[model samples]
Target: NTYNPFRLDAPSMLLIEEWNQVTAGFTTKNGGESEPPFHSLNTGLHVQDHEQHVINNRKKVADILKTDLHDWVFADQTHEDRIHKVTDGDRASGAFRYDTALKATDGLYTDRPNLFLALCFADCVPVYFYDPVRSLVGIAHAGWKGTALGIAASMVDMWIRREGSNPADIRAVIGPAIGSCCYTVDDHVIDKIRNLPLQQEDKAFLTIKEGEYRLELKEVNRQLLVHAGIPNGQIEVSSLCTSCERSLFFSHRRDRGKTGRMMSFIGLK
Candidate 1:
């Protein structure tokens, strides 16, 4: 099977070869048709984009993945660490329809084939996971609060609890978001992230710049995944930064909440 992810430019060439066979994943906003502010492509309903435009945008994303849009599952994303497992029964219950499945929660996990898990984000990190051995997949929306709270690790825990999959066997990817170079944070975020057991390189996740503090969301989330038991090599981090590349991605901080939304999606093949 071929694995092609939607990147900022030409569909992302970046991929995890080991987990390539189990599932295909992509980050959004590189292509589609919705106008300025909302731009040509947007996949969020909460941003006040036209409902029909959002529908078409989602259809385009599915087209890129070569999957049916109706099979997509999403969460309400309260910025908490809760993850909900989905099944074919949940899909049949109309959970995959737009805005239908996103009632309450910030993450989604599923072992069922053909059920796409979608999570919206602008500056927030979108974390995706796969277990080729168990055929399990998950997606989490992690901003600073969610990252500091360990949402990425929580996903692995949920997988072990419900599907009996080992964290070491789980391959994960941290999708494009605000990087340390652009993500400035307050004292509260810095203190919390500093306390978590972190890697030496990740000390850069929280930094000081001209007397202001900044946070690299991706690094913090990656550290949490590593400390949660996933091997460092098994966790892949994307270099694309939403706030840095305003031309290709939408950043809430850069746009001041007026920016359109992009989504990170994953599912079993």
Candidate 2:
């Protein structure tokens, strides 16, 4: 029904209360062992943070989720719209090492239990999916690029074609990111949003300014999911803005690119 925020010792997490068999949430920038910029709770491995510290931070998350570190898979996120259907054999593919992480992948889904799919984010939207009827779960990293490409709809198509999931059974969540208030873009980006096969009214997702536009990435992705056939009532959008809540989240835009990363994680337990 409703997603609620909670604190786990040091890390802050949001739990999707409706899915009983699944553990779904996003990590906040707290309760870990990282230095300034990535002060603490930074789950990204490729950010030049100490490898052990990153691993240690991951271990903290794994513990909080009641899963082993080896059971979690990380994404190499390139802001693309590529989606990957994970298998048991792919477990730990990018768990502890960045070099071995899922390459150029921004979306991951699985019907398997005990395997946690995790992706790093800092102002980039984290999109979550769940098909209760099929017991399937998915997560995606959607920045402005992925948003323009309709990664949310891509994930829906993957579930339908590959997992035999019905669009009506799918529940989507548009997680925290840089809100429209903080995400200003130029004509180059606005053109891409305009080109999407969305209705004319959907263009209002962007607030036009003198020479730039404020883009609501969450709304854009939400509309894309709706256009893909998911009912409007099934999609949940978070009001938390990473850029506005500096103490709670890491914002690449707000932090000027020198910041830590939080993680979005989900799995069937």
Candidate 3:
């Protein structure tokens, strides 16, 4: 399995070594022109960073991917379970700008070639989906709110019912996010996670400690995919926690809301 090379301090990207038809990966918090807080490589335009700087940072990523910024598409990402099937017309939406992004959407899927689908992230999990047999790719933003709503499962269902994809043939990857090791939650959040239609064995997604609960958002999404008929062996999880690796990733929780956002992108070449 060939993998993409990681450049030294040049906007670190964690590529999915298993995927070859498309370039898929999550960006790190390095190499760009944004100011501190956003301090270099901040791809998010809505985070109070200079719009021109954010655009420049995005262009830098596009150059690394060997694609133009206009070929990429992005989502507004409101932590909702909404998934939109992207087409050629949606190409370049929210690419260089933010207002044109798919509104109220957190998940994007497409079979079209040469069009990149991207979503911004800090602490939220980036769920990636690829079906080699169908030549389809999808990316979802799964925060705690979206996880509780089963956004991962919804992606599977959409592929099955709408796109006619076989769950067994779909390969999934859970990208870097805030892990349970640093994600402590209140009882209210724990209660919401507990209410998910998960198997008893999967209830361990939340670990009770003293009076607080450490929620495993990645594990919760993985279990949701499994419950939605995705084979456990077909899924891959990342060990890099955004909250734990302060130097590598921007963490909303760790930075107390003053953080830049990384960009998770996937597209067929």
Candidate 4:
């Protein structure tokens, strides 16, 4: 496991140990303050959870991260590949409220300090990026669709083209998600992977009896990042499966869609 666990009430997070100034990790669904369907620790407002519970849940993560919850930015994600470059003016865009989230964004990156970038997830891949030399940090929510769309590579491209980062200096972490062992998809998902660009990974998919398939979504993103020019040694991948780790996470598939979300975050401390 390239990503290690930390104790923020037993959080299943992946820390970027090499980058000390960056506070980045994915949250576990344990220890939150919400009611059922969301049971507890529901960090997303879109799950029909009480608004205040979501706010409080974020505050707990904020407390552990040792940063202001209101200083974090949230996006109204639609599973698209749009990556936003956060700025001072965008501080807390959707921190306290969901209606104010940045619209249609699934990827966020920033070069500033004290402004955390957060996105909600329930088994979606959390792709984290940091270029220590340029002081840039990013977090992207990559579901199979976003992974097929190459959001991981897009983040690398964004850092290089927009933030002037050298590919060699950029480090990426492919955080936890629904591992292939627990995630099965139909032809619909596989067809999307068929059109995947620059993907060299054949092991990302396994035959699960006919059109149904098992996907290593995180590995697909790792391959995409490598194809995008980041050195393979600089990219780290986690093996934790959200579905199998029932005690540690909330799984949307395992729970049949009625589950809370974990937030993946990154920022300069």
> Local distance difference test, per candidate?
0.73, 0.85, 0.86, 0.84
Return the TM-score for each candidate structure.
0.87, 0.94, 0.94, 0.94
Give per-residue CA lDDT, model 4, range 1-269, as digits (tens). Answer: 32353323354344555556888877876777798888688889888889998899899888877889778999999998999999999998999988889999999999988999999988999888888899889999999889888888899988888778999999888777999989889988888876777545556888869988988898888888888899999887877888987876789989999899988888997
lDDT for model 2, on a 0 to 1 scale? 0.85
lDDT of 3 by residue, 46-162 (tens): 898999999998998998889999889998889989999999999899987789999999999999999999999999999999999999999999998998899999999999999
Q: What would the per-residue lDDT of candidate 2 be over residues 1-269, giving only the tens digit for each residue? A: 12343223334566666665889888888888999889888889888888898899899889877889888888788988989888888899889888878999999999998999999999998989998899999999998889888888999998988889899999998888888888898888888888887886245455566768888888888888998889999888888899998778889998888888999999988
Two-way lDDT contest, 1 vs 3, winner: 3
Which residue pairs clash within candidate 2?
Answer: none
Which stretches of candidate 4 lie above 4 Å from their native place?
Answer: 1-15, 199-201
In model 4, pairs of residues that clash are 32-41
> How many pairs of residues collide in each model?
3, 0, 1, 1
Model 4 accuracy (lDDT, Cα): 0.84
Residue 4 lDDT in candidate 1: 23
Please report, as a residue range, the 10-residue window in candidate 4 with the lowest summed lDDT.
Answer: 1-10
Off by over 4 Å in 2: 1-10, 201-208
lDDT of 1: 0.73
Angstrom error at residue 86, model 3: 0.6
What lDDT would candidate 3 get against the real structure?
A: 0.86
Best by lDDT: 3
